[PDB]
Design a protein around this ligand. Structure first.
Ligand SMILES: Cc1cc(CCCOc2c(C)cc(-c3noc(C(F)(F)F)n3)cc2C)on1
Lengths: 273, 255, 40, 59, 59, 255, 57, 40
């Protein structure tokens, strides 16, 4: 594959470098169209910039917390973090979000990796070997209310049991209801004057609940859970303007008020180098 | 003697001519088409009114002044009250369509100004309030009037900073979307053919706007010494390959 | 060799190797030849 | 007020014109459908698609 | 039940009206049935909200 | 075991069933069809909404009592406000259509009564005033409600004597027109398929009613001892092979 | 595998939507039996509802 | 490849791919044709 062909002097009626950008087209002008060039080869395929590679690596998409402690007298297990849940979404942590939002529609399979790390902030005689249970609770499935509900039986919901300090790994097929996931959605759930706007109404993927299976020890253990997402078998459509301003909320395109200029201001002239 | 500048577009019983065009853009190089069996899900036989809805509808003219920020229309919203197309929109549960957008603006070889005409699929607007505030139905359904980017914020409405495309992205990058410029010194019209773009075969035409059309002044308007400091901008849109499905009662929408 | 029954569990797809920028760079109705006047 | 054979009986009244006999939304995973075999099985899954067969037998 | 995903509404009305014969009085009833067409698709298995317990059952 | 009595008619997303029919009449043995090139004059490509207008619309039920004289509807008038069909009617200069008329009326094997259901092409009504008085637009455009033959005369309106078919001809000879009877002891429904009948290829659908439908009690209603002395009559009509031409502004008609 | 066949207007002596549930049978009535339909494909096998999968976790 | 001697130790069976609802939907003695009067 040639990068540049050999091209010499020129004196024509054919002017490749004069165009009309109001047509909306970006004419494929090459260096050999405006200067004398020599032959060079690409020695390059562009593998690393393939959308499969671009979205094909794990990125942290959520961090949450649960803890192992005596549940005696706790009236709201959920609030006490005896167990916690995550309303599944990929737009909470901004790094992966900006990448995905480089496109309008996106379709792919997902590979999840869940890392659980223990912590004992105050006096403990040892570190306990806790087992985490991550259960997927799809829309319509009964949500856990107590860390040891009948819901954790998980007869139909899928769930993994892994050691804290260890990692959990599994993949999920493309689960969108449509032919592709929407990164943006200029619409509502119905024609209502007050209903929510944006993908907020589209990305209703249920949530996944986490808990520590072990009963409590004398001391209290804080387990932090990090979920990583890697896309595979990727397809992307309709490229768009990259995000410029900071995000403020999951799902909305909203940006903060009194935000700072994102375009750098010259320390001098428009003639400055 | 055929030129990129002279064109005629005939849809239904409506025809458009322009002697100062700059070619025409066909979004993602795809001409609109009807929904093929292989992609269909909805089992209802669809209705194709053809020429009674696939024709040019001219919106109300806007006035471009030295201080204009830009305008934003949404489809199919902007045509929600246009003849039979509009009626079909509310009488059916589902619908799908493509369009030919034709923006007009003439001046003289003494004027100067440059409008960016772009089509943005799934243009999800942002709330000027930031945080997690939503943008109420009415404010993204301005209809034929469209949204004036130089108008003041309003409760429940979207942010209207031209610089941030009403969505947190920079104006300069709007060119990644199918667009065209109306550079008075070259142009006087912009034409964009839009194929149906969505993640579903067919969809509700009232609760979802597939794309929004934006006419944004980049190089400000300049009129010759002592001339009227304004120019009109006219938007004409024609639906094409329009299909309606699931006919019934007729929606009653917010406001 | 694939160890699992479902397609979703296989590893990455491998370079699409299609690459056609023209649908974004030249989405014009009338073909424009490099060198020929853009507006004739 | 309680589960009864009567909850399966849709009343029809003589000499009524134009009037409505019954109505219901179509959330097959809730409401009237929730306890039916269809609704019951449908609830073991998150997504559904297809056509429903609704029948009425006069007695 | 999800709004964006709503299926619509089902209703029944009197086209003409119910006419009873002589010496016949009261109410007649309709029995309604629901089932899926071969059209039907179901996916993403999950636990149902139609069953639960507070403690393990014993013999 | 197929019978003349059991029938199903499906048009668009609407279906009709009857288990006590008496065959069905197809006016002059001709099924409705679209306008062929050889007969066309108007050069405009026509619009064929198909299933969105070719479906059954049910009018308001009438009440048949021991003293009812009869009812008269006019087409396309009676459907002037029915969904997309109605809209197309007023948005186009011209249109042409056929229909399937289905009149319903059930009772019991103890009741008795006989309705004449007839379709009359060019049913030009007479003024009760005689002389050379005309019948004003509104009075021949009752819409879905229709004209009640037992109602009193009104200034500008038509004569309503059932015996004289509202036009100076005798009731008994109405049978020369495509008709059917609903004889309670045999029937409960009447079905008539009407092809487009006119001296012109296509025509205005607001200023001209091609046919009128009449439901006339011949043998009076009789109910069993102590039963409600009335029965409802329902009229359901579906346009077929509907074509519209010359789309524009949308008529504004008298009243 | 087709989900729905193309089916147009209808005016028959054959009434597929009239049955007698007292027989104990659920006649396989389809949308194309009561409305005008277009052709669509299943693109679905029903793997996840196989008893092997249902009790297989 | 199966690593164990007994059948019970192998993994899931894979879609039956039979599917015949008629033994539940149409368990009638006399065949009933769709469209023909249910009770003749
Ligand atoms: C955009 C976009 C795309 C997606 C895909 C979300 C996938 O949702 C899941 C997740 C996050 C986990 C599981 C899952 N299955 O088993 C487990 C367990 F191990 F966590 F229990 N988790 C299943 C689905 C459908 O979400 N937002």
């Amino acid at each position: 594959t040639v990068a540049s062909i050999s091209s010499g002097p020129k004196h024509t009626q054919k002017v490749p470098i004069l165009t009309a950008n109001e047509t909306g087209a970006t004419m494929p002008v090459l260096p050999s169209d405006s200067i004398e060039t020599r032959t060079t080869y690409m020695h390059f395929n562009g593998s690393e910039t393939d959308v499969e590679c671009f979205l094909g690596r794990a990125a942290c998409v959520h961090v949450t917390e649960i803890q192992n402690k005596d549940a005696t007298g706790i009236d709201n297990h959920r609030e006490a973090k005896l167990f916690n849940d995550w309303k599944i979404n990929l737009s909470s942590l901004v790094q992966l979000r900006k990448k995905l939002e480089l496109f309008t529609y996106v379709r792919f399979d997902s590979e999840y990796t869940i890392l659980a790390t223990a912590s004992q902030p105050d006096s403990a005689n040892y570190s306990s070997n806790l087992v985490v249970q991550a259960m997927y609770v799809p829309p319509g499935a009964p949500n856990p209310k107590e860390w040891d509900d009948y819901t954790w039986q998980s007869a139909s919901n899928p769930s993994v049991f892994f050691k804290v300090g260890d990692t959990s790994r599994f993949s999920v097929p493309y689960v969108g209801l449509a032919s592709a996931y929407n990164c943006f959605y200029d619409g509502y759930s119905h024609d209502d004057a007050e209903t929510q706007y944006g993908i907020t109404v589209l990305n209703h993927m249920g949530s996944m609940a986490f808990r520590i299976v072990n009963e409590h020890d004398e001391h209290k253990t804080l387990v932090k859970i990090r979920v990583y997402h890697r896309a595979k078998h990727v397809e992307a459509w309709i490229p768009r303007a990259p995000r410029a301003l900071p995000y403020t909320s999951i799902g909305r395109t909203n940006y903060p008020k009194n935000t700072e200029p994102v375009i750098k201001k010259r320390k001098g002239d428009i003639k400055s180098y | 003697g055929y030129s990129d500048r002279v064109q005629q577009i005939t849809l239904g019983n409506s025809t458009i001519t322009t002697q100062e065009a700059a070619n025409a853009v066909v979004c993602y190089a795809e001409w609109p088409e009807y929904l093929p069996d292989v992609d269909a899900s909805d089992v209802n036989k669809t209705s194709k009114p053809d020429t009674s809805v696939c024709r040019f509808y001219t919106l109300d003219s806007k006035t471009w002044t030295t201080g204009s920020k830009g305008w934003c229309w949404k489809l199919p919203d902007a045509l929600k009250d246009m003849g039979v197309f509009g009626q079909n929109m509310f009488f059916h549960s589902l619908g799908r369509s493509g369009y030919t957008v034709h923006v007009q603006c003439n001046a003289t070889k003494f004027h100067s100004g440059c409008l960016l005409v772009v089509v943005i699929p799934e243009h999800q607007l942002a709330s000027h309030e930031g945080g997690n505030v939503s943008v109420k139905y009415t404010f993204t359904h301005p209809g034929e009037r469209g949204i004036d980017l130089s108008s003041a914020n309003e409760v429940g409405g979207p942010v209207k900073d031209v610089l941030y495309n009403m969505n947190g992205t920079l104006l300069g990058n709007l060119l990644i979307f199918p667009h065209q410029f109306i550079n008075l010194r070259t142009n006087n019209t912009a034409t964009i053919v839009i194929p149906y773009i969505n993640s579903v075969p067919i969809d509700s035409m009232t609760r979802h706007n597939n794309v929004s059309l934006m006419v944004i002044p980049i190089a400000p308007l300049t009129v010759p010494t002592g001339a009227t400091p304004s120019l009109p901008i006219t938007v004409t849109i024609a639906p094409m390959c329009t299909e309606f499905s699931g006919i019934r009662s007729k929606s009653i929408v917010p406001q | 060799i694939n160890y699992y029954k479902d397609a979703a569990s296989t590893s990455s797809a491998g370079q699409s190797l299609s690459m056609d920028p023209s649908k974004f760079t030249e989405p014009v109705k009338d073909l424009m030849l490099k060198g020929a006047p853009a507006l004739n | 007020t309680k589960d009864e054979v009567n909850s399966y009986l849709i009343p029809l009244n003589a000499n009524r014109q134009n009037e409505q006999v019954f109505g219901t939304n179509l959330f097959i995973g809730d409401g009237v459908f929730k306890t039916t075999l269809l609704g019951e099985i449908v609830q073991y899954y998150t997504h559904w698609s297809g056509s429903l067969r609704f029948s009425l037998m006069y007695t | 039940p999800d709004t964006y995903t709503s299926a619509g509404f089902l209703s029944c009305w009197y086209q003409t009206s119910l006419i009873l014969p002589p010496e016949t009085t009261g109410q007649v009833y309709l029995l309604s049935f629901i089932s899926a067409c071969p059209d039907f698709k179901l996916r993403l298995m999950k636990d149902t909200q139609t069953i639960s317990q507070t403690v393990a059952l014993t013999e």
